[PDB]
Amino acid sequence: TEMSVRKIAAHMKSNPNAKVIFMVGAGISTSCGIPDFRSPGTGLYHNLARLKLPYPEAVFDVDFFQSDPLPFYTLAKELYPGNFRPSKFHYLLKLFQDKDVLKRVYTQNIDTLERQAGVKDDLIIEAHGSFAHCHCIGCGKVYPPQVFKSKLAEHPIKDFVKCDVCGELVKPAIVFFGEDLPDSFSETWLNDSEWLREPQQPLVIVVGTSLAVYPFASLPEEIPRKVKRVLCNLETVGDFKANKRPTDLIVHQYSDEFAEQLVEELGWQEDFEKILTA
Amino acid sequence: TARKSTGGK
Ligand SMILES: [Zn+2]
């Protein structure tokens, strides 16, 4: 908590021109009202919980989708951008960009709240896709998102969108379990990895993720040993657990609390509050 | 290349 936040600020103040890569997961959007989807109940996933799946990851599993598209359709209705406000942590990413110390944010989330907080498209890698377009799970043919978004408004949701070439189901280009990740993910990580290998020391900060989903969870062990890694998470997970490095910094904090503490350790409160009030 | 999963290495 305290000392490791001081050490992060210590690194940033002693490497003022260095940039930071963030790698984030579902924990940074829980405060927004988006739960980590395996545990349903009151809130966003309420009406998903009623007619519920044979396994927790069924809603984002392409095999289950094939067998029954209605649970995902019901979930997607709640997840289109515009339903939620970005969290304090999302706005911290915008503050790092304003200060010219944001190299990239790699996100496992599909809520696009990094974008909605104002992070530039160039600096966001949406590793698990987004609602920006649709695709056939058979052809791979691409479709505009409106083909799908319009069905989401119907009462009830029935006659799911199908491919006009091969007749298989069409869905948003979100990466389900069982599907390939977008080319931009591997290609940009390959470039940022080379940049991490090139005396202003960069920094990688991993926030709010269990590091249980691959290949995204491979990224922390691929950070060079000469580059300091930070994990801000409720528990020590992933490569930080299995293969601790002496310079690793662990912050067992909620992500909004971490944002608040780091902002005022850096002395950036006044800029941060201006961002928060817009 | 890389496919999404809960398993891995
Ligand atoms: Zn098709």
Residue numbers in the entry:
A (entry chain A): 8 to 205, 214 to 293
B (entry chain C): 6 to 14
What does the paper say about this structure?
The Spt-Ada-Gcn5 acetyltransferase (SAGA) complex and NAD+-dependent histone deacetylase Hst2 could function as the writer and eraser of histone Kbz, respectively. In addition, we demonstrate that a subset of YEATS domains and bromodomains serve as Kbz readers, and structural analyses reveal how YEATS and bromodomains recognize Kbz marks.
To elucidate the molecular mechanism of Hst2-mediated debenzoylation, we determined the crystal structure of Hst28-294 in the complex with the benzoylated H3 peptide (H35-14K9bz) at 2.0 Å resolution. In both structures, Hst28-294 exhibits an elongated structure containing a large Rossmann-fold domain and a small zinc-containing domain. The small domain consists of four α-helices (α3-5, α9) and three β-strands (β4-6). Both the H3 peptide and the cofactor product bind to the cleft between two domains. In the Hst2-peptide structure, histone H3 residues from T6 to K14 were modeled based on the electron density. The majority of H3 binds to a negatively charged surface of Hst2, explaining the preference of benzoylated lysine flanked by positively charged residues. Benzoylated lysine 9 (K9bz) is snugly inserted into a relatively hydrophobic tunnel and adopts the same geometric configuration of H4K16ac as seen in the Hst2-H4K16ac structure. The bulky benzene ring of K9bz induces a 20° rotation of the phenyl group of F67 to coordinate a π-π stacking interaction with the benzene ring. Additionally, K9bz induces shifts of I117 and I181 to generate a larger space to accommodate the benzene ring.
